[PDB]
Amino acid sequence: ALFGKGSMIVVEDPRDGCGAYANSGACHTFLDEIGDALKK
Amino acid sequence: MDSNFLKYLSTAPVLFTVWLSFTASFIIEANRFFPDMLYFPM
Amino acid sequence: AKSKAVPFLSQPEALDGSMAGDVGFDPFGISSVIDIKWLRESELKHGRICMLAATGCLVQEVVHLPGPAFSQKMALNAWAAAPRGGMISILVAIGLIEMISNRFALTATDMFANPNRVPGDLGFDPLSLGANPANRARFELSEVIHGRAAMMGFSGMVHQMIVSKQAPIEQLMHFKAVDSSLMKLGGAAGNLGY
Amino acid sequence: DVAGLTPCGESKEFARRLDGSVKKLQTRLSKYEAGTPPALALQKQIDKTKNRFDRYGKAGLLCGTDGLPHLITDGRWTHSGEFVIPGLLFLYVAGWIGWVGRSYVLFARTADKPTEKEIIIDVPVALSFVSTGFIWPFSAFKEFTSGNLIVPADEITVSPR
Amino acid sequence: VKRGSKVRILRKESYWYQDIGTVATIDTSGIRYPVVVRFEKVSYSGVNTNNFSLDEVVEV
Amino acid sequence: DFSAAVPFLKRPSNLDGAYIGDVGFDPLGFSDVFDLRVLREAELKHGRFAMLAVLGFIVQELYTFPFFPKMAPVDAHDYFVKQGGGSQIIFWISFVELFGVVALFETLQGKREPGDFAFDPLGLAKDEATLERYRLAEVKHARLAMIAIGGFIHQYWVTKQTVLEQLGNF
Numbered sequence: 001a002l003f004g005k006g007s008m009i010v011v012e013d014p015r016d017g018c019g020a021y022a023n024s025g026a027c028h029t030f031l032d033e034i035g036d037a038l039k040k
Numbered sequence: 041m042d043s044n045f046l047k048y049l050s051t052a053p054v055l056f057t058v059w060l061s062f063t064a065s066f067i068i069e070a071n072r073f074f075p076d077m078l079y080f081p082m
Numbered sequence: 083a084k085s086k087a088v089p090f091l092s093q094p095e096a097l098d099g100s101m102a103g104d105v106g107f108d109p110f111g112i113s114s115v116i117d118i119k120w121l122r123e124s125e126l127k128h129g130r131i132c133m134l135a136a137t138g139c140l141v142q143e144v145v146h147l148p149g150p151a152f153s154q155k156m157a158l159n160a161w162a163a164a165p166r167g168g169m170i171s172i173l174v175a176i177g178l179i180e181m182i183s184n185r186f187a188l189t190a191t192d193m194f195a196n197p198n199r200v201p202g203d204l205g206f207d208p209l210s211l212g213a214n215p216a217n218r219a220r221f222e223l224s225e226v227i228h229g230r231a232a233m234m235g236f237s238g239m240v241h242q243m244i245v246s247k248q249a250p251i252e253q254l255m256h257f258k259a260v261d262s263s264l265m266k267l268g269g270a271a272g273n274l275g276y
Numbered sequence: 277d278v279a280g281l282t283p284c285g286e287s288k289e290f291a292r293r294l295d296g297s298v299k300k301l302q303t304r305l306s307k308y309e310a311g312t313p314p315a316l317a318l319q320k321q322i323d324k325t326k327n328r329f330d331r332y333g334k335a336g337l338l339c340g341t342d343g344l345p346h347l348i349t350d351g352r353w354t355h356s357g358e359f360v361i362p363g364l365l366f367l368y369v370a371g372w373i374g375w376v377g378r379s380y381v382l383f384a385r386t387a388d389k390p391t392e393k394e395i396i397i398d399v400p401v402a403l404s405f406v407s408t409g410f411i412w413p414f415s416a417f418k419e420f421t422s423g424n425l426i427v428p429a430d431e432i433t434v435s436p437r
Numbered sequence: 438v439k440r441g442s443k444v445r446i447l448r449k450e451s452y453w454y455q456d457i458g459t460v461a462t463i464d465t466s467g468i469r470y471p472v473v474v475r476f477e478k479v480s481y482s483g484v485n486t487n488n489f490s491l492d493e494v495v496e497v
Numbered sequence: 498d499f500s501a502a503v504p505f506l507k508r509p510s511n512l513d514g515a516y517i518g519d520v521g522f523d524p525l526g527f528s529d530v531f532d533l534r535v536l537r538e539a540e541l542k543h544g545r546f547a548m549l550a551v552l553g554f555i556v557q558e559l560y561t562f563p564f565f566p567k568m569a570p571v572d573a574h575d576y577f578v579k580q581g582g583g584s585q586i587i588f589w590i591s592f593v594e595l596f597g598v599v600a601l602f603e604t605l606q607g608k609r610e611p612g613d614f615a616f617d618p619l620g621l622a623k624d625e626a627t628l629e630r631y632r633l634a635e636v637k638h639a640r641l642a643m644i645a646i647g648g649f650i651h652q653y654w655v656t657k658q659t660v661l662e663q664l665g666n667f
C-alpha cells in the first residue's frame with residue numbers, strides 16, 4: 001500500500017496539546033496575545 | 041496618466057537610462073547581498 | 083461607469099464583467115496596457131501555485147513524508163533540507179508540464195494563438211468535474227477567489243516565517259510578538275552602509 | 277594539482293594574502309575607539325575580507341605561487357563553475373537579449389512608421405517581447421530551421437564586388 | 438513590370454541592389470531608365486527613389 | 498469684479514465659486530498659475546490629515562491603547578519612529594496614496610471631483626443639497642483643523658504640556 005512500517009507518513013499535532021485561548025506560560029496563542037494586549 | 045507624458049517616457053533615452061539603471065541596480069544589489077562571486081559555486 | 087471595487091475611479095476597459103472575479107479592480111490600468119487574456123492566465127497560474135503553496139505550508143506542518151530529510155516542520159527549512167536531486171526533479175517536471183500543458187505556445191506572442199485557447203483553460207479536468215455547465219460560473223469564480231486569497235495568505239505565511247522562525251500553525255499556537263530589536267526594515271543607506 | 281597549481285585552502289601564499297589583508301585593516305582599526313562609526317565600518321570590512329578568503333579556500337579554486345586564485349578553463353568538469361557554467365548563464369542571457377531585440381525590430385518593421393517605434397518604443401509590445409526570451413534556444417532554432425532567421429543571399433544588399 | 442508592383446533591383450552599383458522597392462511610374466517614351474522605383478530605406482545621399490531600366494528590375 | 502472675503506481685492510479669475518468654501522481668497526495668485534483641481538485635492542488632503550490629527554491628539558491624551566505605553570503625541574511620533582508602527586502607518590498611507598495618485602489622474606482627466614473618493618459608507622449624504630452643505634462644512638473644518646494642529650504642536654514645543662492639560666492648567 002506504499003510507505004510501510006519502516007518509513008511511514010509522519011503525522012504530528014502542531015497544536016501541542018493546548019487550547020486556542022485561556023492558556024498558561026507554556027502556550028501563548030495569537031488570541032492570548034490579543035487578550036494580553038487588551039489587559040495590560 | 042497623460043498619454044503624451046507616457047509617450048515621452050517611452051522615448052529611447054528615457055527607457056535606455058531607466059533600463060540600464062535598473063540593470064545596474066540589480067547588479068549592485070546582487071553584489072551587495074552575495075559579494076565576491078568569482079565563480080559559479082559548485 | 084465607475085468601478086464597483088474602487089468607486090471613485092473610472093471602470094477600466096477590458097474589464098466588462100464577463101470574467102469571474104471581474105469586480106472592476108484595475109486602478110493602475112495594467113489591463114489597458116496588457117491584454118486581459120495574459121493577465122487572467124497569469125492570475126490563475128499565480129493563484130493555483132499559491133493555493134498549493136498555502137496548502138503546502140500547512141500540510142507540511144501537519145504531515146511529513148518519512149525520513150530525516152523531510153522532517154522539517156517549518157516550511158522554509160524544507161527548501162534546504164529536501165534532497166536536491168528531487169527538488170530539481172520537481173523543477174524539471176514543472177518545466178515539462180509548462181511546455182506540454184501550454185502545447186508549445188508558451189510566450190506572450192504565441193499563447194492564445196489558437197482562438198479556442200481560453201485564459202486558464204489548459205485542458206485540466208481529470209475527473210471531469212466541470213462536465214456540468216451550471217457550476218462553471220460558480221467554480222470559475224470560486225477558483226479565482228481561492229487563488230487570490232491563497233496569494234495573500236502564502237505571502238503572509240512566508241513573511242511570517244521570515245520574521246518569526248516558526249511554522250505558521252505553531253506560530254499561531256506558540257505566538258511570540260515582534261520585539262523590534264531585530265528585523266528592522268531598510269536601513270542600508272541611513273547608516274551609509276555597513 | 278592542475279597545471280602545477282595548489283588548492284587555495286592549503287597554499288601558504290593565499291594564507292599570507294589573507295593575513296596581510298586583515299593586518300592592513302586592523303592597523304586602520306587601531307586608530308579608532310570601539311563604538312565609533314569608522315571602527316564599526318572597518319570591522320565589517322575585516323569580516324567581509326575574512327569571509328571572502330574563507331569561501332575561496334573551500335571552493336576548489338587553485339592558487340598560484342602568488343597566492344591568488346587561478347581559473348582553469350580548458351573544459352574540465354571539476355572546474356566548470358569558473359567559466360563553462362558562468363558562460364552558459366551568459367549565453368542564455370545574451371541570446372535572450374538578442375532574440376528579444378530581433379523580435380522587436382521585426383515587429384517595428386510592420387508598423388505604420390517603422391522608425392518611430394525605435395526611438396519611441398512601444399513599451400507594452402516590447403515587454404511582451406522581453407518576456408519571450410526565456411525559451412530563445414528553441415524559439416530561435418525553430419526560427420532558423422523554418423527559414424525565418426536566415427534570409428537568402430539574393431535578398432541582401434552587397435557592394436558591386 | 439507595372440505601376441505599384443514590388444521590385445528587386447539588379448543594378449550592382451545601386452544603394453538598394455537586391456533590395457525591394459515599389460514602382461511609381463513607367464515612362465512610354467524613348468527613355469533610357471523608365472522604371473521609377475521608390476524605396477523605404479534612404480541612400481547615403483538621403484534620396485529614397487531612383488529611375489531604373491527594365492533589365493535592372495525583377496517582379497517579386 | 499471683487500472678492501467676497503477681501504472687499505478691496507479683486508476676485509481671482511480662476512475662482513468662480515465652483516469649488517465649495519470659495520470666498521475669493523487668493524491674494525498671492527496661486528490659482529492664476531496652478532490647476533485649481535490639484536490645489537483643492539491638496540487642500541482637502543492636508544485638511545483631512547489635519548482633522549484626523551486633531552482628533553488624534555485629543556483622543557491620545559484621553560485614552561491610549563493598553564499595549565502601547567502612555568506618553569505625549571510628539572513623543573509618540575518619535576517612539577513609533579523607533580518601534581516600527583510609524584513605518585507601518587507610513588506604508589499603509591503610501592499604499593492608499595498610490596490609488597490616490599490614480600485618483601488625481603482621474604481628476605486631471607476631468608472625471609472626478611477633487612475631494613471625492615465616493616466614501617459614504619454610512620450614507621449621511623442624502624441628496625445634492627445636504628452634500629453641498631456638508632461639503633462646505635468639510636472644507637471649513639479642514640481649514641480650521643490645519644490651523645488647529647499647527648497650534649497644538651507649536652504650543653507643545655513652547656510649553657511641554659498637552660492641549661487638554663494646557664486648557665486645564667494656566
Ligand code: CLA
Pocket residue numbers: 131132133134135137138139141142145146147148151152153154155160161164168179183204206
Ligand atoms: C506550491 C507547491 C509546493 C511546493 C513547491 C512544495 C515543495 C516541497 N514540498 Mg510540499 N506539498 C504541497 C505543495 C508544495 N510543496 C501540497 C499541496 C501538499 C499537500 C498534498 C504538500 C505536502 C507535502 C508533504 C507532506 C511534504 C512536502 C515536502 C516538500 C519538499 C520536498 C518535495 C516533496 O517530497 O514533496 C512531497 C509532495 C507531496 C506529498 C504533494 C505535493 C504535490 C502537490 C499536490 C502539487 C501537485 C501539482 C502538480 C504539479 C500536478 C498538477 C499539474 C496540472 C495542474 C497541470 C519541498 C520543499 C516534504 C517536506 O520536506 O516537507 C516537510 C514533505 O514531507 N510536501
Ligand code: CLA
Pocket residue numbers: 164165166167168169171172175
Ligand atoms: C524518471 C523518473 C524518476 C526516477 C528514476 C527518480 C528517482 C529518484 N527520485 Mg525523483 N522525481 C521524478 C522522477 C524520477 N525520480 C519526478 C518526475 C518528480 C517530480 C514530481 C520527482 C520528485 C522527487 C522528489 C521530490 C524526490 C525524488 C527522489 C528520488 C530518489 C529516491 C527515490 C526513492 O526512494 O523512491 C522510493 C520512494 C517512493 C516511491 C516514494 C514515493 C512517495 C509518494 C508517492 C510521493 C507523493 C506524490 C505526490 C502526490 C506528487 C504528485 C505530483 C505529481 C503527480 C506531479 C531517486 C533518485 C527523492 C530523493 O532524492 O531522495 C534522496 C526526493 O526527495 N524525486
Ligand SMILES: CCCCCCCCCCCCCCCC(=O)OC[C@H](COP(=O)(O)OC[C@@H](O)CO)OC(=O)CCCCCCCCCCCCCCC
Pocket residue numbers: 267268269270271272273584588
Ligand atoms: C502588489 C504587491 C505589493 C507589494 C507591497 C510591498 C510590501 C513591502 C513594501 C515595503 C514595506 C515597508 C517599507 C518600510 C521599509 C523602509 O522604508 O526602509 C527604509 C529604506 C531606506 O533606509 P533609510 O534611509 O530609512 O535608513 C533609515 C535609518 O533609520 C536606519 O538606518 O527604504 C528603502 O529604500 C527600502 C526598500 C527598497 C527600495 C527598492 C525596492 C526594490 C525595487 C523594486 C522595484 C520597485 C518595487 C516597489 C518599490 C517601492
Ligand SMILES: CC1=C(C#C/C(C)=C/C=C/C(C)=C/C=C/C=C(C)/C=C/C=C(\C)C#CC2=C(C)C[C@@H](O)CC2(C)C)C(C)(C)C[C@H](O)C1
Pocket residue numbers: 007127130131132134147148149150151152172176179180183204
Ligand atoms: C506547472 C504550473 C503549476 C505548479 C506547480 C508546483 C510548484 C508544483 C510542485 C509540485 C511538487 C512539490 C511535487 C512533489 C513531488 C514529490 C515527490 C514525488 C516525493 C517523492 C519522495 C520519494 C521519491 C522518496 C523517498 C524516501 C527516501 C529517498 C529516503 C527516506 O529516508 C525518506 C523517504 C522514505 C520519503 C500549477 C499546477 C499550479 C498551474 C499551472 O499548471 C503551471
Ligand SMILES: CC1=C(C#C/C(C)=C/C=C/C(C)=C/C=C/C=C(C)/C=C/C=C(\C)C#CC2=C(C)C[C@@H](O)CC2(C)C)C(C)(C)C[C@H](O)C1
Pocket residue numbers: 107108109110111112127128129131132134135136137138139142156157158159160161233234236237
Ligand atoms: C509550499 C512550500 C514553498 C513554496 C512555493 C512556491 C512555488 C511559491 C510561489 C508562490 C507565488 C506564485 C506567489 C505569488 C504571489 C502573488 C501575489 C502576492 C500577488 C500580489 C498582487 C497584489 C496584492 C495586487 C494588486 C493590484 C491589482 C490586482 C490591480 C492593480 O491595478 C493594482 C494592484 C497592483 C494594487 C516553499 C518553497 C517555501 C517550501 C516550503 O517548504 C513549502
Ligand SMILES: CC1=C(C#C/C(C)=C/C=C/C(C)=C/C=C/C=C(C)/C=C/C=C(\C)C#CC2=C(C)C[C@@H](O)CC2(C)C)C(C)(C)C[C@H](O)C1
Pocket residue numbers: 133134136137206207208209210211212228229231232234235236238239242250251253254
Ligand atoms: C480542478 C480539478 C481537480 C483538482 C484539484 C486541486 C489540487 C484542488 C485544490 C485546491 C486547493 C489546494 C485550494 C486551497 C486554497 C487555500 C487557500 C485559499 C488558503 C488561503 C490562506 C489564507 C487566506 C491565510 C492565512 C494565515 C495567515 C497569513 C496567518 C498564519 O499564521 C496562519 C493563516 C493560515 C490563518 C481534480 C484534480 C480533483 C480533477 C478535476 O477533474 C479538476
Ligand SMILES: CC1=C(C#C/C(C)=C/C=C/C(C)=C/C=C/C=C(C)/C=C/C=C(\C)C#CC2=C(C)C[C@@H](O)CC2(C)C)C(C)(C)C[C@H](O)C1
Pocket residue numbers: 522523524525526527542543544546547549550551552553554557569570571573574643644646647
Ligand atoms: C505625528 C503624530 C500624529 C499626526 C499627524 C498628521 C498627519 C498631521 C497632519 C497635519 C497637516 C497636514 C497639517 C496641514 C497644515 C496646513 C496649513 C496649516 C496651511 C496653512 C495655509 C494658510 C494659513 C494659508 C493661506 C493662503 C490662501 C489659502 C490663499 C493664498 O493666495 C494666500 C495664502 C498663502 C495666505 C498625531 C498628531 C495624531 C499624534 C500622534 O501621536 C503623532
Ligand SMILES: CC1=C(C#C/C(C)=C/C=C/C(C)=C/C=C/C=C(C)/C=C/C=C(C)/C=C/C2=C(C)CCCC2(C)C)C(C)(C)C[C@H](O)C1
Pocket residue numbers: 571574575643644646647648650
Ligand atoms: C518637526 C516634527 C513634528 C511635526 C509637525 C507638524 C505637522 C507641524 C505643522 C505645523 C503647522 C500646521 C503650521 C501652520 C500653522 C498655521 C498658520 C501659521 C496660519 C495661521 C493663520 C494666519 C497667519 C491668518 C489667518 C487669517 C486671519 C487674520 C483671520 C481670518 C482668517 C485669515 C484671513 C486666514 C512631529 C510632531 C511629527 C515630531 C517630530 O519631532 C518632527
Ligand SMILES: CCCCCCCCCCCCO[C@@H]1O[C@H](CO)[C@@H](O[C@H]2O[C@H](CO)[C@@H](O)[C@H](O)[C@H]2O)[C@H](O)[C@H]1O
Pocket residue numbers: 165166167168
Ligand atoms: C530510470 C531513469 C529514467 C531516466 C533517468 C535519467 C536521469 C537523468 C539524470 C539523472 C541525474 C541523477 O541526479 C543525481 O542522482 C541523485 C538523485 O537523488 C542524487 O544523489 C543523491 O541522492 C542519492 C539517493 O539517496 C544518494 O545515494 C547520493 O549519495 C546523493 O548524492 C544526485 O545528487 C543527483 O545529482
